[PDB]
Structure formats: structure tokens, C-alpha cells
Amino acid sequence: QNTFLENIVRRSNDTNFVLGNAQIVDWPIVYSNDGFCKLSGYHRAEVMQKSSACSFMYGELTDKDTVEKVRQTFENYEMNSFEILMYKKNRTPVWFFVKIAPIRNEQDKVVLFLCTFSDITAFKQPIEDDSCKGWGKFARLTRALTSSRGVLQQLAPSVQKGENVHKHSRLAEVLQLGSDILPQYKQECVFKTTWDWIILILTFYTAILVPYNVSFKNVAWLVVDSIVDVIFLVDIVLNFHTTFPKLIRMNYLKTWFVIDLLSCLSSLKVVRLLRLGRVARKLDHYIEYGAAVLVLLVCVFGLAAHWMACIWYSIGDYEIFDEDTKTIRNNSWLYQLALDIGTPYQFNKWEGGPSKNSVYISSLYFTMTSLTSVGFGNIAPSTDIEKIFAVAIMMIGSLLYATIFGNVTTIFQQMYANTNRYHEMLNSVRDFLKLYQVPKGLSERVMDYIVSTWSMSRGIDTEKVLQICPKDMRADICVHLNRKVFKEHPAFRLASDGCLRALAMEFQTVHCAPGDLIYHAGESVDSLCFVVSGSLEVIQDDEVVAILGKGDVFGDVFWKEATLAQSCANVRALTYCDLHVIKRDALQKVLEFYTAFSHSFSRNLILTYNLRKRIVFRKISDVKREEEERMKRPDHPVRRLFQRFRQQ
């Protein structure tokens, strides 16, 4: 987007300016702000289309040497600055400081001119053609140079030598504005995706490995642990730096920085469990995707399984040796587990029982039985704190199983509604056709039409899709849709592009099935048709009169006739035909609007077949009958009727 005006008016700070066209003779004004309207005393429409030299603002005391200096700076495309007595709408002699900056382009062309203004009346000299008094003209000069003296020469009324300080500072403000004349009238991440992916898999790593290291407590795991720490710190500084600079840093310190700092800095290793705060960055990224939330629920299901498995082992380990009496108590899932798999605990000391890998996967098996509502009961809780933990994990497993089932059911509901609406409309059409006892050929024809247009369109109301778009986008879409007419016919290559869009907005598109007829003989012809694909036959009295191929126009010339006629012939299709039709009313609307186009349209459009003009012909069977009639070789009430035919 090109915010060429907004940057100038933001930098300007109550100073005023006009914009003129640098590439047009006499340099006409294309824009003037309200400050220039107030200082000039003119209105926007009255300012624009005048010269940006502001020759209408000149006067008898306006120096012509400054005028040709302005002309030279406009011709040479040169940043300059001048002061000149110019007049207003009330013809007051007002000295102006015009600063002219050419405007380059992305193509570096000198396309515009910027002329900024101020009032230098009080700064130089008061000169009046007539005034009430010297104080009155002086007061008018001070009131005119109000925003010059006021909001720029603030402390300058205390000091002397304002021409040496404050006027030079206003000229330097115009110089910094010329430094800000850079917008030049032109329009002015995958690393984040890959970074969020690798920190997501590392958050899965730490959510597996931290409760593992809490409960069950090499070297290369410590190496990759330090890699996890430094990559997390790089992610913190990237969450500082990257887009949504200092305002997003303050927003990050408000939002998430305390958790993300304490997450990755000896019991406080459980504080590392808060590293899943990074996962909420990706959770919004794939909540729109639906089938991946099933994968999200399965992943958090396994993650919570690993979590509460380590919690379950922690409960067993807290329970076996909770006292200094060192009793096994004959009651724990660890003790029943050691009696189950073998090697019960022994003492010589207290020699441990089961191996830690078997312990972890046995505990994960137990937590999976809990969260999956299976519940075998090999490992099954019998101590107090493990039982209240069992209640807790069963209440969590119910909700996790519910969320999985609801997500799967919603996935199936979308995947089934998208086909069920089509199957239901097909079933209702079959029900309707069976209701009214359509002859089976026509029922099959309408049915295979419905299946064919549902295979082609895939269930898209394309006209409604065009209603979703705005006006110009829909018109340009229609122009691309009717490129198959407009690039092909000589009738349309002389049209204006506005006429192209105002035509293309009226063109329906027909997908004719083979064997299906468009205009039956006797139907109203009200829409000339262009054939962009397929092959057509024209049947007059059971006889093929015209074969229409690609790029042919039939129907009836409306703009010459202005008369509705009957189709003198059937028009049937031979192949899958693509037609681009236009009714006569919209055609006549466009042709009445585009008057200079319509004559060239009449001269260029040659109908391949008039569907009004019945063509006279005889069959060869008829002249065979006439040749047979050599073997054969009152009229007064009827021949007068033939004389009425003579009167006809």
C-alpha cells in the first residue's frame, strides 16, 4: 500500500502543502490539504486543476523573476525554496515560503511535485496596496503568520534576530521535510514455523524427560539437555524480537515472560514442567486445522499418560519406605508388582526388586489402563494415597476420553455432512421423480444431469461465490470467465474495458449435455449465444440445417430488430457444449450505454444462424414424390382465398 499522503501529513505538523502533477503541462494541482485551503482562503475544488505554480495567487507586486524561477525549478525537477508576495481570495498581499520537492518513483520517474507553504509577511516587510492603518495591516500580518510564528517560533518572541534564528529554523524544518519527501508514491515467516516446530518437539522432549528425571532420576542425555536449555533461551530472545519492537517486548513481559524465564534457567526441576507454556504458541496455530487436533489430543493423551505414570511411580516409591521403621507393609503396587514379575525385595540393607525399565513401562501400562477406561487390574491401587490418586486419574481419564470421542465425532460429522447433503438432495430428487411417475428415460436424464453437475461443480454455488467477492473483483472474475469469448471474437476486440466488465457481468454460462436442446422450435429467442466449446445441430422440420462449432454465434440480432421472435428451429447439442449466453435485456442495456461501441458491435458480429429467419427448402423425398406424380397426370371458394393470399 502507498501511504504517500499519510506520511507527509504526519511529518508536516500543522504545515501545509499542495501536490501537483509533474508529468503534465502547466503542472496542475492534484491535492491541497485543509491548511492550504485555510491559508489560501480557497476551496479544494477551486484549488485543484489550477497550476501548482499558483499563478492565480499572483499579483501586481508578485515578482516575475520568482515566477520564472519557479518555472525553472519545475522544469529541471529541482528541490528549491523561495519567498514571494502572493495574493489570496480576498487579494491580500501575503509573503509565502514555498519549498518545492520533486517526487521520484519506484521507477524513479518524476511523477509528482510537492509545494509546501508558510507566511513570511511579518518576517520580511509589510506592504499594502491599501489598508485602514499601519497597525491594522500589521495586525493582519501577525494574524496571517499565526501557525508560522506560534507553533514553530515558540521562544523566539523573547529573543531578537528572528530572521537569523527562527526563520532559519522553519526553513530547516522544510529541509527535514524534504528529507522526508522519500515516500516517492509507491507501495510501502518460514523460520518462525520451523522454529516453533523444533521447540514443539523439544517441549515434547522435556515433558517426557523431566518427570522421568524426577521419578527415576548417561552423559549424552546431559549434552542434549544443555542443547535444550540454550535453544530455549534463543527462543526467549526470539519471542522478544519477532513480530506479533520494544512494544512487543513489553507485551511479552506482560504476557508470558515470567513463566518462560522461570521455566528454563534442585527440586525446582519440577519448575521445568512449566516449559509447556511454549506449546500455547502453537495451539492457536493449529486450532483452525481440525484433523490435527485429533493428533493433538492423542499426543496430550500420551503425554498425560507419561506424566501420571511418573506420578504413579512417585506414589509407589513414597509409599514403600515412608518411615524409618523400613517396613514393606505388604501393600503397594510396587510390592505386588515385585511379587508378580519375580525377585521380591530382600535385605542383607534392602536389596531392590524390579528393574527400573520394567517399573516404568509397567506404571505406564497402569496409567494407560486408567486413561483408556480398560482397567485390567494387574497393577491396581490398594494404599490410601494411591487410591485418591486413582480417583484423580480416573476423573481425568473420563474427560480425556470424552474429548477424544467428541473430537472424533465432530471429524466424522464434517466428513459426513459434506457428502450427506448431496446424497440427501439426490434422494429427494429420486423421491420426487418416483412420486409423479415420470417416464423412466426422462427421470434417468435428469438424474444423470444431477450427478454430472455434481461431479463437475463438486457442489459449489459459483454465483454465490461471486456474490462473496466485491464489485470490481467479481467483474474481473467474470472477465476471466468470458475470456473464451473476448479473446476469440472480432465483435469484442474494439470494446472498452468498462464495456468488457459490464458485459461479462451479464454472461451466463451453460454446460449443455449432449442430446439436450437449448431452443426448441417455437420457443422465444431472447438470448444470443456464443459457443466456446462443443458441437451443435440446428433442426428445422426434422432436418439438420446448421452445424455450429467452436466460436459461433446464434440466437437473434436484437439491437437491429428490437422485436421478440419465435425460434423457427430446434437447436440441439451434439457434444458436451460450453455456451456463454446473454439475454437481450442486459445486452440492450449495455449497448444503450456504450453507444460508440454498439455500432462496431453491429458491424463486427455476424450471426452464424438467425433463429428468427425461417429458411425455405424442399426435401428430396418431396421431389421424388413430384416425379412420381406424372402417373396422376369447385376451386372458386378456395382460390379466392388464394387470391386473399395474393392480398397477403
Q: Which of residues 585-604 bind a copy of itself (CB under 8 A)?
A: 593-594
Residues 553-582 that bind a copy of itself (CB under 8 A): 564, 566-567, 574-576
Radius of gyration of the chain, Cα coordinates, nearest whole angstrom: 44
- Which stretch, 125-133, 196-204, 207-215, 420-428, contacts a copy of itself (CB under 8 A)? 420-428
Q: Is the dihedral of CA 598, 578, 425, 459 positive or negative?
A: negative
Residues 246-275 that bind a copy of itself (CB under 8 A): none
Contact 334, 353 (CB under 8 A): yes
Backbone torsion region of residue 565, taken as left when φ is above 0, otherwise alpha when ψ lies between -120 and 50, otherwise beta: beta
* Residue listed under C-alpha cell 485555510: 38
Residues 283-302 that bind a copy of itself (CB under 8 A): 287-288, 290, 298, 301-302
For a copy of itself, the closer of residues 125 and 327 by Cβ is 327
For a copy of itself, the closer of residues 273 and 574 by Cβ is 574
What element of type H or E holds 217? none
CB atoms within 10 A of CB 306: 21
For a copy of itself, the closer of residues 144 and 577 by Cβ is 577
Residues 126-185 that bind a copy of itself (CB under 8 A): none
Least distance (Å) between residue 542 CB and a copy of itself = 9
| Residue 438, CA distances (Å) to 422, 433, 435, 442, 526 in order | 22, 6, 8, 7, 29
For a copy of itself, the closer of residues 279 and 569 by Cβ is 569
Site mask for a copy of itself (CB under 8 A), range 347-376, x = bound: ----------xx--xx-xx--xxx-xxxxx
Least distance (Å) between residue 439 CB and a copy of itself = 7
State which of residues 221, 350, 412, 642 lies at the interface with a copy of itself (CB under 8 A). Answer: 412
Residues 319-348 that bind a copy of itself (CB under 8 A): 329-331, 340-342
Residues 36-55 that bind a copy of itself (CB under 8 A): 43-45, 48-49
Least distance (Å) between residue 498 CB and a copy of itself = 3
Q: Using CA atoms of 42, 43, 49, 51 in order, give the dihedral in degrees to the nearest 10.
A: 20
The amino acid occupying position 168 is: H
Residues 76-115 that bind a copy of itself (CB under 8 A): 111-112
Tell me if 455 contacts a copy of itself by CB under 8 A.
Answer: no
Least distance (Å) between residue 194 CB and a copy of itself = 23
What are the backbone dihedrals phi and psi of residue 543, each rounded to the nearest 5 degrees, phi first? -135, 135
Q: Can you give the length of the chain in residues?
A: 648
Residues 174-213 that bind a copy of itself (CB under 8 A): 187
* Residue listed under C-alpha cell 474494439: 494
Residues 514-533 that bind a copy of itself (CB under 8 A): 514-518, 520-524
Least distance (Å) between residue 561 CB and a copy of itself = 15
State which of residues 223, 402, 451, 638 lies at the interface with a copy of itself (CB under 8 A). Answer: 402
Tell me if 21 contacts a copy of itself by CB under 8 A.
Answer: yes
For a copy of itself, the closer of residues 131 and 336 by Cβ is 336
CB atoms within 10 A of CB 114: 22
Least distance (Å) between residue 493 CB and a copy of itself = 16
State which of residues 544, 625, 642, 644 lies at the interface with a copy of itself (CB under 8 A). Answer: 544
Contact 177, 129 (CB under 8 A): no
Q: What 3-state class would DSSP assign to 94?
A: strand
Tell me if 318 contacts a copy of itself by CB under 8 A.
Answer: no
For a copy of itself, the closer of residues 49 and 125 by Cβ is 49
Least distance (Å) between residue 214 CB and a copy of itself = 21
DSSP characters for 583-598? EHHHHHHHHHH-HHHH
Tell me if 3 contacts a copy of itself by CB under 8 A.
Answer: yes
Burial 176-208 (b: 16+ CB within 10 A, else e): ebbeebebbbeeeeeeeeebbeebbebbbebbe
Cell numbers linked to 230? 540454550
Least distance (Å) between residue 264 CB and a copy of itself = 30
Least distance (Å) between residue 450 CB and a copy of itself = 7
State which of residues 60, 108, 323, 472 lies at the interface with a copy of itself (CB under 8 A). Answer: 472
For a copy of itself, the closer of residues 124 and 583 by Cβ is 583
The Cβ-side half-sphere exposure at 386, using a 13 Å CA radius, reads 24
For a copy of itself, the closer of residues 269 and 624 by Cβ is 624
Site mask for a copy of itself (CB under 8 A), range 474-513, x = bound: --xx--xx--------------xxxx-xx-------x---
Contact 540, 568 (CB under 8 A): yes
Nearest to 35 by CA among 54, 7, 13: 13
Burial 482-508 (b: 16+ CB within 10 A, else e): bebbbeebebbeebeeebbbbbbbbbe
Number of residues that bind a copy of itself (CB under 8 A): 161
Question: How far apart, in whole angstroms, are the C-alpha atoms of residue 562 and residue 564?
Answer: 7
Least distance (Å) between residue 633 CB and a copy of itself = 21
Quick one: three-class SS letters along 151-207?
CCCCCCCCCCCCCCCHHHHHHHHHHHHHHCCCCCCCCCCHHHHHHHHHHHHHHHHHH
Tell me if 547 contacts a copy of itself by CB under 8 A.
Answer: yes
Question: How far apart, in whole angstroms, are the C-alpha atoms of residue 495 and residue 317?
Answer: 87
The amino acid occupying position 147 is: S
